């Protein structure tokens, strides 16, 4: 499926089955904090299905950290640190079955939450270790799952297919294309450029991903002696590291997200950048004339 994010669903508390867990009354016979971390569960996943990821988890990180700044609307947690922990290990798993199993959203969810929440220790709960995801979906979670495999994926590969980016590069726009169409001679010419790319021109989950990349325009050109010419071959792209660039924050949460950046080391000790590979082609087949 290629749910890249693009459409806004509609979702509240009640769509989310650890909500439901938290707000069953039967399942808790006296007031727990447990049950309160299940019912804040809701609020959040509302927010994550459509994207609205720096939030909720901004909220969770200034009261662990005492930032004494705004909550976003988000109530004040008994362990605001343990919803931050179990969110972190959460979102790369619903990313990843949108990718895998074409989950929609909240079901992707629901499926990623369908677990016991001890409480995170010191002594290996949550179990990090997840080497089946591997490749993004480029959709909702897609950013929270980036940034959630900078803290805990021990500088593990990720893969990012190129056409789950979302972008539509215009060949014919490039200064680099339109200066070798130029300059090539007559006849068949083999054509091979490095050109940077600012993904969030297209895509918002690419550019809150990977931000600017490197592509790679590769084919064979045609000028005609009739003025006549065409382009065929396809555009690649380089691997990307994911250091979690304050360039690629999205304006209204960066300085948030920038004092996060510089603080999570302190909690998530195996923080580390990773590179995204950006594997696969996209076609292109394009034509024209001179204007002279
Ligand atoms: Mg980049």
């Known amino acids: 499926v290629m749910d890249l994010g693009t459409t806004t669903i509609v979702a509240g508390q009640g769509d989310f089955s650890a909500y439901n867990y938290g707000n069953n009354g039967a399942n808790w016979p006296a ?35 005492n930032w004494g700044t705004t909550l976003y609307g988000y109530p004040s947690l008994p362990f605001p640190n343990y919803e931050f922990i179990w969110d972190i290990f959460d979102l790369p798993q ?37 080497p089946k995801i591997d490749t993004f979906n480029g959709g909702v979670y897609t950013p929270a799952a980036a940034f959630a495999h900078y803290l805990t994926g021990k500088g593990k590969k990720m893969n990012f297919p190129i056409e789950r980016l979302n972008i539509k590069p215009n060949v014919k726009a490039m200064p680099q294309f339109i200066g070798v169409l130029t300059s090539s001679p007559m006849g068949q010419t083999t054509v091979d450029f490095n050109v940077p790319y600012a993904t969030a021109k297209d895509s918002w989950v690419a550019g809150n991903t990977v931000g600017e990349i490197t592509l790679r325009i590769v084919g064979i050109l045609v000028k005609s002696t009739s003025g006549q010419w065409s382009f065929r071959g396809e555009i690649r792209a380089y691997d990307d590291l994911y250091d979690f660039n304050p360039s690629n924050h999205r304006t209204e949460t960066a300085e948030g997200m920038t004092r996060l950046g510089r603080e999570v080391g302190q909690k998530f000790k195996d923080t580390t950048p990773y590179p995204i590979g950006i594997p696969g082609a996209i076609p292109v087949n394009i034509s024209g004339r001179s204007h002279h």
């Not at 569960?41 to 662990?64: F, H, I, S």
């Not at 949108?98 to 369908?114: E, H, V, Y």
């Open 31 to 65: 007031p727990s904090p447990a049950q309160v971390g299940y019912i804040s569960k809701g609020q959040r996943d509302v927010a994550y299905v459509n994207g609205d990821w720096e939030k909720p988890l901004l909220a969770l990180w200034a009261q662990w950290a």
């Open 94 to 130: 619903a990313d990843y079955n949108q990718f895998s199993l074409g989950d929609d959203r909240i079901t992707a969810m629901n499926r990623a939450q369908n677990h016991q929440y001890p409480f995170p220790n010191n002594e290996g709960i949550p179990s990090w270790d997840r």
